[model samples]
Target: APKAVLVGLPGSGKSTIGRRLAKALGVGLLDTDVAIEQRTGRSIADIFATDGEQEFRRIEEDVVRAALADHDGVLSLGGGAVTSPGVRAALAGHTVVYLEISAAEGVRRTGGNTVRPLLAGPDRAEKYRALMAKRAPLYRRVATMRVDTNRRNPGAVVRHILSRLQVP
Candidate 1:
């Protein structure tokens, strides 16, 4: 059984926090985005451009569901994975954490990452705000707990998660 599943907007540090959490637990951390890349043998941007967003979501849902079922440690999903209702539904009965970040923080953290197909192009901050507005609720809806990462370092955030999950 997986110890935790992390869902949140981009720049919430799912990957970073997940790494620390898994290390604290002496377990492995599996990221669905990396799993998707491994499975498809391509970059995420390439996948979005070649296979299309619809296809990417379908594959994401499939990969997320599978990881939820099989992974034993910490599992972090892609930023937009929760946008899929199927993915959200599959998260039931799991320890899902919503790593919340403010829209400005998200934009600031993600601005340099050009590989994000959704956040590409003009009006990046506006796009981030819109994305947060649309997806924040979905993250909350699927989460077993919420942790705001806006002001916390990775170590502090991990401590908070361990405290909440009571994993010693």
Candidate 2:
């Protein structure tokens, strides 16, 4: 079977939920963030701080490519992975699912997590809102399935996605 790629903004529960979904589906989980960290031997914050968003995205794309090359697992992309055109092109013919979370819910879920570089600023909420607005259309363009994860538990979200994909 082809892999399912889970894409969403930061704090959208992709990593946490993707892990559970992979286990339930009897497949491995490949988190692009984790893979990038593993490949570069640097934390995401450090990478972004030292190299800037472009460099970080380059690494992210490399990690995504490598992950896809090796395993047909459930893949969870970083929040900004879709910002790369190459990443979007590579997702063609893949089962891509976007976990849709409201901006208010996102802020509540993130809770001042400084690890997210994009959310580190005085006007964090404003920045988040803007980023979400920019990325939502890109996500919609690539997503074969979209799930509003605001009120759904992780298990329920997984079940909903499986049903949509017609997976038993």
Candidate 3:
């Protein structure tokens, strides 16, 4: 089983914290987004630019499901992974860490990058707010624990998660 599965909005520090947590534990980290990119030989931005969100989510659900089943270290998911019912179902009984952050902070952290696909086009802040509203409950529902990343540095966040960790 994975040591932990990290989930949350973009820029909520899933990658950053997952890397730190994995290193601290002397384990590897499998970020599902990177996994997908490797599997497809394409960047996530390009995938979304060509195939659209439904396609992206379909692939993501499968990748996340597979990662959850086989990963023995730490796992980090794409920001919108919880939106898929399959991903949520696969998370049952796993240690899921929800890295919580406000929508404004999310946008700020991501620099409102259009390259993110979901954050593409105009009114990015508004879109991000709507995304948070829609996805927050999903994240809450799937999480085994919730950690606020709004005020915490990556190291502090890693330490907090480490503290909560139970020895195997």
Q: For every model in order, what is the number of clashing pairs?
A: 0, 0, 0
Please provide, for model 2 over 1-168, each residue's C-alpha lDDT reduced to its tens digit, 9 standing for 90 to 100. Answer: 236999999879998889888988899998888888888899999988888989999889888877766768899999999999988988888899999999998877877645788887677778889989999999998899989999888889989988888853
RMSD of each: 1.5, 1.7, 1.7
Report the candidate with higher TM-score, 1 versus 2.
1
Residue-level lDDT of model 3, residues 1-168, one tens digit each, is 899999999888888899899999899999999899989999998888889989999999998888888899999998899999998999999999999999878888877433777775578888889889999999999999899998888899898899888633
Judging by lDDT against the true structure, name the best candidate: 1
Q: What is the TM-score of each candidate against the true structure?
A: 0.95, 0.93, 0.94
Which ten-residue region of model 2 has the weakest summed lDDT?
Answer: 107-116
lDDT (Cα, 0-100) at 9 in candidate 3: 91
Candidate 3: the clashing residue pairs are none
lDDT score, residue 152, model 3? 80
Those runs of model 1 whose alpha carbons end farther than 4 Å from true positions after fitting are: none
